[PDB]
């Protein structure tokens, strides 16, 4: 069933085996159920760590390629290895997408959850853009835009800025505008927008868990201020 893999994954977290953890959540989704909060989070925690590893792996290898470029006999092995990771992440991104675009948003029953899984689309497509070579990126970038904007409509005038999932969206969509679209002006706009509205909100784990999200916006706003 689903639980038969909700304990295992919980233990995979415990045992820092997120590749297993992810693979358990995949089956938990493949079960055919609107994920719980416990079970949803796990999927994220699981896959976020899987993609995260690749993304942070790719970033360092890409960075290493900043020693010899597209045509060299010393930074030719990097690009080829970076491409291997590019593939790995893509497969992992597409996997999460397959889970998300097949039965992750349509199965989701709640409204606050809709935002969340779409935020993943805005996340996971963005990851794709970073690695999306050639002209194909352009579209993949729109994927994240259509997604992170779509989730912004459901999170906008729907949940209080206090919401950490609405604010988490802010973060990621802003960092999408900045990091991918390289549109700092628009990024800072969205950030201020979210942060501003979020100030006029009042919440008594929303105390801290929703306060750190804001602290990042402000940090980014500051980073993109200079």
């Amino acid at each position: 069933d689903k639980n038969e893999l909700v304990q295992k994954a919980k233990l995979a977290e415990q045992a820092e085996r997120y590749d297993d953890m992810a693979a358990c959540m995949k089956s938990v989704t493949e079960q055919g159920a609107e994920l719980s909060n416990e079970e949803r989070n796990l999927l994220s925690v699981a896959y976020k760590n899987v993609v995260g590893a690749r993304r942070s792996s790719w970033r360092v290898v890409s960075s290493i390629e900043q020693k010899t470029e597209g045509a060299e006999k010393k930074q030719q092995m990097a690009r080829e290895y970076r491409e291997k990771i590019e593939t790995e992440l893509r497969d992992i991104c597409n996997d999460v997408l397959s889970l998300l675009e097949k039965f992750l948003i349509p199965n989701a029953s709640q409204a606050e959850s809709k935002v969340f899984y779409l935020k993943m689309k805005g996340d996971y497509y963005r990851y794709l853009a970073e690695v999306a070579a050639g002209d194909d990126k352009k579209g993949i970038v729109d994927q994240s835009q259509q997604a992170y904007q779509e989730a912004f409509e459901i999170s906008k005038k729907e949940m209080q800025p206090t919401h950490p999932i609405r604010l988490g969206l802010a973060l990621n969509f802003s960092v999408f505008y900045y990091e991918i679209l390289n549109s700092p002006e628009k990024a800072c706009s969205l950030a201020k927008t979210a942060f501003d509205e979020a100030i006029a909100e009042l919440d008594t784990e929303s105390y801290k868990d929703s306060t750190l999200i804001m602290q990042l916006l402000r940090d980014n706003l500051t980073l993109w201020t200079s």
Binding site: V45, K48, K119, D123, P164, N172, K208, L212, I213
Partner: peptide, 8 residues
């Protein structure tokens, strides 16, 4: 669980 759940 709160930062990593929502991926920053």
């Amino acid at each position: 669980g709160x930062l990593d759940x929502l991926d920053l």
